[PDB]
């Protein structure tokens, strides 16, 4: 079929759907064209071996105000993650200690080093900000030193530097600390409101949506009706100063005034542009890449850790699994754990056989919470790296030096072509809240233009 719209939107993830919804609200007509047999992108709720799981993005923090309004507008409610009782910390030397409150139970030197670093990171984030971190006069020096090297320049305490890295490198950017810059650590902190917010799992991992995060996309898409096309990878964008024509599988053709690429940046060159994008985009898009993380799901007869006085939360920068949390579904009698295996530790697990990998990850949940972690009734690993329409998790970031070099260009339109995804967001960078903000910002930009 051939259609005529004011805006063609490539990608029916939360970012494209939020842009579509805002455009519709303002009276513009839209078509959203999606590759997969479903909407939601990196958010997805599925049933595996009888257990309902969130395969992707799921948590809402209190600074995610754009996602919180959108939830309210769609009739969706939240619930809080279980946090009663003791958390577990595993030290660099391998000592396992139960604790409550909000510092790790390390020796005092380490604790004071961590506090000081948290404070320095909060300070940098408040000064530099998430809107245009590259523009600050401190930015050049921060963007040309790796986060690993910057931590070495700040502190002699190995354990403190490893735990600070746990929160940014394994915990957010899903890349090793030697491979992105101090500035990129600052941006990640600023985007979430402060580094202290990313440190406190009670803040950044506070709530979930009743019915799952994918419902945010599913409900936006339901309201768009026949203007959403599924099973339709977009292959070609033909453009000029006044116009873009978008071509997709199934003989789909959309003639639009503007196009929104609502896809992560590592995937822009999956589409052919006629004429080609300018040199600056050709170069910039090469320097953007997704991290890699395994999101592990483990379902048990009950949340057994709660009988032992444990919250289910566990941190260990030297473990294969660096984080574990209670991920029990709203009103479920069965318990579910969630755990994360990050970057180079993920590659290492994927090189083991499926059997050996499972055994290694369950051994590690057992190190945190006890030998009952070893007996789930359902076990599943989210595998976003294999998915050709994602190719990693959670989200994309520049290589080292790319944030200062290309950051000012990452949202600029090219003629009628706009860009919108969480991976180029300011507040809410990498999160559904960022996807939502960017979709709304791109919509408002198009509306003013037209």
Ligand X SMILES: Cc1cc2nc3c(=O)[nH]c(=O)nc-3n(C[C@H](O)[C@H](O)[C@H](O)COP(=O)(O)OP(=O)(O)OC[C@H]3O[C@@H](n4cnc5c(N)ncnc54)[C@H](O)[C@@H]3O)c2cc1C
Binding residues for substrate: 340
146 binds, among a second copy, ligand X, none (CB under 5 to 8 A by kind): a second copy
282 binds, among a second copy, ligand X, none (CB under 5 to 8 A by kind): a second copy
Spatial neighbors of 47 by CB under 8 A, at least 6 apart, are: 53
CA–CA separation, 430 vs 338, rounded Å?
19
Q: For a second copy, which stretch binds (CB under 8 A), given 55-63, 123-131, 143-151, 427-435?
A: 143-151
Burial 58-90 (b: 16+ CB within 10 A, else e): bbbbebbebbbebbeebebeeeebbbebbbbbb
**Interaction of residue 194 with ligand X, rule CB under 6 A:** no
List 374's β-bridge partners, or say none.
Answer: none
What is the x/- site pattern for ligand X, positions 370-409, by CB under 6 A? ------------x-x----xx--xxx--------------
**Interaction of residue 149 with a second copy, rule CB under 8 A:** yes
Annotated binding site for FAD: 15, 34-36, 42, 58-59, 234, 422, 430, 432
Please report, as residue ranges, which positions from 2 to 21 form the binding site for a second copy (by CB under 8 A). Answer: none
What is the x/- site pattern for a second copy, positions 391-420, by CB under 8 A? xx------xxxx--x---------------
Q: For ligand X, which stretch binds (CB under 6 A), given 50-58, 90-98, 116-124, 151-159?
A: 50-58
Report the residue from 42, 197, 219, 258 that binds ligand X according to the rule CB under 6 A: 42
Assigned token pair, 381? 């690993």
* Shorter beta-carbon distance to a second copy: residue 42 or 175: 175
CA–CA separation, 66 vs 434, rounded Å?
8
**Cβ–Cβ < 8 Å for 141, 135:** no
State how far the alpha carbon of 314 is from the alpha carbons of 330, 340, 361, 369, in Å.
21, 11, 14, 8
Q: Name the residue among 220, 238, 221, 218 with its Cα closest to residue 229.
A: 221
Number of H helices, E strands in the chain: 15, 21
**Interaction of residue 292 with a second copy, rule CB under 8 A:** yes
Report the residue from 112, 148, 306, 372 that binds a second copy according to the rule CB under 8 A: 148
User: Three-class SS of residue 6?
Assistant: strand
**Interaction of residue 265 with ligand X, rule CB under 6 A:** no
Assigned token pair, 416? 């009628």
């Amino acid at each position: 079929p051939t259609l005529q719209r004011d805006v063609a939107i490539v990608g029916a993830g939360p970012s494209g759907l939020a842009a579509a919804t805002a455009l519709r609200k303002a009276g513009l007509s839209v078509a959203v064209i999606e590759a997969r047999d479903r909407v939601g992108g990196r958010t997805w709720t599925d049933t595996i071996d009888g257990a309902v799981l969130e395969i992707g993005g799921q948590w809402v923090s209190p600074d995610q105000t754009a996602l919180i309004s959108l939830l309210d507008e769609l009739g969706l409610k939240t619930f809080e993650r279980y946090r009663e009782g003791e958390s577990v910390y595993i030290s660099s030397a391998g000592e396992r200690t139960r604790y409550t409150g909000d510092s790790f139970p390390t020796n005092e030197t380490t604790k004071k080093e961590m506090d000081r670093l948290i404070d320095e990171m909060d300070d940098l984030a408040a000064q530099i900000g998430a809107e245009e971190p590259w523009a600050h006069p401190l930015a050049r020096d921060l963007d040309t030193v790796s986060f690993k090297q910057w931590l070495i320049n700040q502190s002699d305490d190995a354990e403190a530097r490893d735990n600070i890295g746990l929160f940014i490198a394994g915990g957010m950017l899903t890349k090793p600390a030697h491979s992105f810059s101090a500035l990129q650590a600052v941006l990640m902190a600023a985007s979430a409101g402060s580094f202290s917010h990313l440190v406190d799992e009670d803040f950044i991992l506070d709530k979930r949506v009743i019915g799952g995060m994918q419902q945010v996309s599913i409900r936006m898409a339901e309201a768009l009706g026949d203007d959403v096309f599924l099973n339709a990878p977009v292959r070609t964008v033909k453009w000029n100063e006044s116009g873009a024509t978008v071509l997709a599988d199934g003989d789909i053709r959309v003639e639009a005034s503007r196009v929104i690429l609502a896809v992560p940046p590592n995937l822009y060159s999956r589409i052919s542009y006629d004429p080609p994008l300018p040199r600056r985009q050709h170069q910039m898009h090469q320097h953007q890449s997704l991290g890699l993380v395994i999101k592990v799901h483990a379902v048990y007869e009950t949340p057994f850790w709660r009988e032992d006085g444990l919250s289910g939360t566990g941190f260990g920068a030297s473990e294969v699994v660096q984080e574990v949390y209670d991920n029990t579904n709203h009103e479920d009698d069965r318990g579910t754990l969630v755990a994360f295996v990050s970057d180079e530790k993920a590659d290492a697990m994927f090189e083991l056989s499926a059997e050996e990998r499972k055994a290694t990850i369950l051994a590690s949940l057992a190190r945190y919470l006890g030998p009952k972690a070893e007996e789930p009734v359902v076990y599943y690993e989210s595998d976003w790296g294999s998915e050709e329409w994602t190719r990693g998790a959670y989200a994309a970031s520049f290589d080292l030096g790319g944030l200062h070099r290309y950051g000012a260009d990452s949202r600029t339109p090219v003629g009628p072509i706009h860009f919108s995804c969480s991976d180029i967001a300011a507040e809410g960078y990498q999160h559904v809240d960022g996807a939502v903000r960017m979709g709304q910002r791109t919509a408002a930009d198009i509306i003013a233009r037209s």
